[PDB]
Design a protein around this ligand. Sequence first.
Ligand SMILES: CC(C)(C)OC[C@@H]1C(=O)NCCN1C(=O)C[C@H](N)Cc1cc(F)c(F)cc1F
Ligand SMILES: CC(C)(C)OC[C@@H]1C(=O)NCCN1C(=O)C[C@H](N)Cc1cc(F)c(F)cc1F
Lengths: 725, 728
Amino acid sequence: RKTYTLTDYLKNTYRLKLYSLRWISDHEYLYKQENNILVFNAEYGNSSVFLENSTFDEFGHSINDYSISPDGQFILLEYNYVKQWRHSYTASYDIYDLNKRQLITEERIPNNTQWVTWSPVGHKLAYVWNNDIYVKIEPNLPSYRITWTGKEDIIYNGITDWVYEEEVFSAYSALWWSPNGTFLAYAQFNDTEVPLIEYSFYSDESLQYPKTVRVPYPKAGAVNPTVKFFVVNTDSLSSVTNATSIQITAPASMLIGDHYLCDVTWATQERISLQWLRRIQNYSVMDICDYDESSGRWNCLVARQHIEMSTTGWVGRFRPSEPHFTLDGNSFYKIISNEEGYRHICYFQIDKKDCTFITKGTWEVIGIEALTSDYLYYISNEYKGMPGGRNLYKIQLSDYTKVTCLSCELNPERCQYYSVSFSKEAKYYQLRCSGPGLPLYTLHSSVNDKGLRVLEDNSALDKMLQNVQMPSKKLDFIILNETKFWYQMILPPHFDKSKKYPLLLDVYAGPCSQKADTVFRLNWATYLASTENIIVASFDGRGSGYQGDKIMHAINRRLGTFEVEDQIEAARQFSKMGFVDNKRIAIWGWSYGGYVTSMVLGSGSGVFKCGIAVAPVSRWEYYDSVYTERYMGLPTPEDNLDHYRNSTVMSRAENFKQVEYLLIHGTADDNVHFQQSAQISKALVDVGVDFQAMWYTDEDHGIASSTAHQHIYTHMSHFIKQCFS
Amino acid sequence: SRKTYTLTDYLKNTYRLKLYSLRWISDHEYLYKQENNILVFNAEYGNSSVFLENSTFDEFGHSINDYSISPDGQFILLEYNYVKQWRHSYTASYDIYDLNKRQLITEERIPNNTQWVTWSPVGHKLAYVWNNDIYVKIEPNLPSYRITWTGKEDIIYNGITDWVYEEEVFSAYSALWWSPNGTFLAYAQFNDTEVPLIEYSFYSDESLQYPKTVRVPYPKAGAVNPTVKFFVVNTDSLSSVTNATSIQITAPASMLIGDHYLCDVTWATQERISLQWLRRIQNYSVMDICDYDESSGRWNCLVARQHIEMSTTGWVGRFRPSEPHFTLDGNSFYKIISNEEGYRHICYFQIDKKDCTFITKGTWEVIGIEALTSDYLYYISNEYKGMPGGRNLYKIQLSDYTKVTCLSCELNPERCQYYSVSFSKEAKYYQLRCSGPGLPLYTLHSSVNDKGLRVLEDNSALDKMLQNVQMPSKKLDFIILNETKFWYQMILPPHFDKSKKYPLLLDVYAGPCSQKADTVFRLNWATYLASTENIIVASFDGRGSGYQGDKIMHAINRRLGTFEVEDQIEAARQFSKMGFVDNKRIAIWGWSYGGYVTSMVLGSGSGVFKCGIAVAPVSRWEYYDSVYTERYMGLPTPEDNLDHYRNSTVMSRAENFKQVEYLLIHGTADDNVHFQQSAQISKALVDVGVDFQAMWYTDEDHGIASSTAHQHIYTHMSHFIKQCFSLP
Ligand SMILES: CC(C)(C)OC[C@@H]1C(=O)NCCN1C(=O)C[C@H](N)Cc1cc(F)c(F)cc1F
Ligand SMILES: CC(C)(C)OC[C@@H]1C(=O)NCCN1C(=O)C[C@H](N)Cc1cc(F)c(F)cc1F
């Protein structure tokens, strides 16, 4: 009866099986079989080989990924993959003509391409090379150069810079096809005056001299990149004259100061929706711009604007939600925080200001998943009032009282956390259950909500897990100021509540974050409970999301206060539970969780014995502007410079004499720069506090390389076991 | 004797060694700082006098870092805003104070951001370097004359050295050399146009939002080196012409065939300057004595005055060809060179004669020439009692080299076995500086009879404090390996009992031509480990160490990381077989070169060592600068010695680190041994999955000498040593 060991987690012994499918039409999806790609008929479950690996085993390159054209007449081959940031990367591409059954060797896609994408229909092709946009009406024909101002580290056409990739759009891409591929909208970011963050990269041992990486990176209060938006007609590309792009400008209420482009969504074939967001991220405006044939220009009627603001904090969770327009584009549904601070779906009209909420309650709609003529499919945490749960719902557009949950009752014993993937027209949908039981994948029919087939049930994994002493998970809540605050505990096998165990507080506690959910996980905490009999707990206090703006906006303009104090208060109640050794309580966290961990260890509460901080934030003036300023405003005396200086971990170095501290950070961290940890170590030296440290050469914010990953979790294990004796 | 020497005592500097730093201003007088007030002493009778009261500048507005009085005693340079650059370079602000008027200058002042200042040997002329250019002030209050115009940041250095020359060649920031009487100003010019830049982050105070990137021209092994030119300008002509002409002195033809260095500048007379050049392959150097042609105003270097100093079994010199010591007429000089037996002694040269004659000989070496008179030549050596780790002052008679007398051997034989000396102007008096094995002792002497005039400082106050302290003892002895004496030292804990088993810490450096076992008395981290933690701190000078003959120093030639590393392991086994060493508790730590050796030792698989600490270590020799590395390893090309470059990396031994506890420490702002080197060590240990302890120090250089970091590193290393030795 072995236990889940550290080797199991580091070597991925027990692996969850997925069912990652991509919908091709309203009733077909592609699936990978390790040797080929199969086309599945959603209605009957039969399949047929769409493309076998014996088609590119002669290529001479390692196939990184494939991209079928919407009409299934070409495929895009990705190779020479080179990662950049969280989403950005670079690769080489080769289009394979499914009709000629051979590669396209004429007018090939250039090497070092930054982003490629088909049109929504047909086989048009837009790609970004050297920060300039190109369009191919045909894969074999020459490409049409759309932009000419592309310049590395300054001008970005069709691609996002660093801050927009990480904080706004969560993608390298800045291209938006029209529904039928006629128009191609894109954004232009300009980092001319944006200060560059510089750090050393050491590379392989052969490199005699280290290289200096420089990235345009606006820290809190620095000069942000400017943005422009354009739309070009891809049906009239002139082979003789240059392409003519039409610029859509932001509303007057946004040009008064610094602002952002935070959302782009096409309504109809000639109507596109833009959402702008002031640098003070509590005021946003949606523009609905239509095309005018007689003038070849895009106009955004003032009467069709839509303001979305907040007085308790920022607008949106991390950005204003995306709209879902109706068939005629004259109406749309989108998630906005209601009057009491609970985010729900509001029915909008293109012409009028007032919207009408179609959902209500002391819970939140996580996201709108699909929209049809009669139904609106969304995910929420309404079932059993558990904020850590996720279920799929359908609300009738003609009668808001007819709401139906499509996943609540399928298997309430093993499934409480759901995601979904709909077909092209939402005729079928795949449900992705991920807890508390083993993940489960099912295929359903939208017309009657009947379960067609079981795609993946992890029955093979369930069998192996029966021969290992696996830990349990306890999801509950405690009361703070007459408010429910949820927590979770990874409990060791054979848990005895009369026995006493060491407790480790696994923390993140970022704004709109959630560490207490019903998701089933096989992670480092699994090993700590199964093998080391350690209770690893997580707590969602003030600042956590999916529980209303009263809890989420509580940390507005005062990061590093309530969410830090609540972690201490929660661990304080944990120590008085009888099964927790109050002399052996630790706390560790990554990224924002490293900041909270360091602020807790420097709080002088005396509750924690030791703690680990991995790639932590130490001084909010060091992190990027879009994220920091969203919760802290500007670091100016006339704004919020007080909390900026009052919430550093360096100012608490003196209180680090009570605890054992392990500080870890990667030298190539483009996100939370090594500077942050270098200033923490320097402050502890100035006050004479001893501590443990560890850098990782050329590792980024993830420290995700195979060898480094195993090394850090091995090093942290020794630190924890040594602190618990 | 109840209290031990605690770690706190070392970090807080409870027991301070008393010093006596004097500055000879004339033939019989020197300056001395009593209590912020500069005193002038008469060596003949000891009576003093006030030269600058302590309140003269306590109302200056700035904290004075150091003073510099003109040789004629009419002015005094006051530098403030001192900011250390490299080991010797620094930037500061300066002010000239007129002594004949007791006022500041306030007119045509020395510009801010001045990189170097220096007086003329006589008078009160002034030459300084600003924005990589040279300026000369005839009078401290009159406008200055610009000598160079090619000065360019990080590209052209005029009057100052670049990073390599400062660290590896001249051991000084200054590249200026006044003529003896001050008529001529000889300077060097360095061009780092194509020299690659080392780049690393500097974070500064936490108020700085964006980390700063430091960029320094740093030629690593094999990279392109800086080029050098030499010039001489006549400062007496600055007044009558608008742009004085600087006469260039080119190097001999035997140096222009390839890359070379300028390794020594030494004036001989008022119109005779000698330059020593060195090929990039540092086994061939050439001295070039040049005279001033009063007729044509040029400098000519007669081929018959050349002197070739080479080596057939390694590099030439210790760290560089030694400097010559000319007589008054400048027609002959004495110089330290390696003899046919490989022992460095003093040779007597004539300006024309290619052959010299050695005046000293034996299985021992001369450390340096101190003073030269018409009668005697004073030098320091380790001849006494055949102890390579001892230092004594000798006096050899010029008219009969068989008449050699030791001036410090028998002064205090039990208390003093390590000596340095500071002679007066014409060597009429000298101060003997004793530094071990007993407490430091300073004495003044008259060179007429070498009579002990008086005791300037005897550390009597410090002696009484150490009476009620359990200080450690020191054993300086040797072992015989392959029929050769190799010396070692041990800091033995108090009440040392050979019937007991003690833990052993092996303090290592073992760089080429270095010495860790000597007679110097020290109050350092080793004193605490022995006095309080009962740990024996041992050091061993194996193959590669200096002051013992070329057969030992040149042993590791082109083989760094081999003989010196293995000799350290063998010394540990030798110490374990002595009886009083616990075999299961032997550690080894080292700084800089010692960190490299420590890492190579811990990655050797010897099984001798349980743990080890490496501070600012070298990882591979292709990461270190050219002039130092190539001197011992040649060029990292396949045709010469690339194989030994790649074979002696610590990364290549990463697998063996699974058998030891490893602590790696390095400062992020290390300009000497770049953080890159420790960054490659850790990344290699991660690639093979071996756990280890790490510690970076933000914005600390190769010394990690900031008050707070210094206390932090020795506190951190103490915990690691005590836990590895199971020490409570
Ligand atoms: C990216 C992620 C988690 C996968 O989810 C996206 C999520 C989201 O909801 N919208 C867009 C972006 N996003 C964020 O969380 C942005 C933050 N920069 C994440 C973050 C916060 C820190 F405090 C910190 F120190 C480092 C750090 F990286
Ligand atoms: C500077 C010192 C000690 C005070 O003595 C001067 C001494 C000398 O004798 N002549 C001139 C220069 N010099 C040297 O030792 C030069 C070396 N760069 C020192 C050194 C060696 C390393 F292997 C290493 F990793 C780092 C490092 F700094």
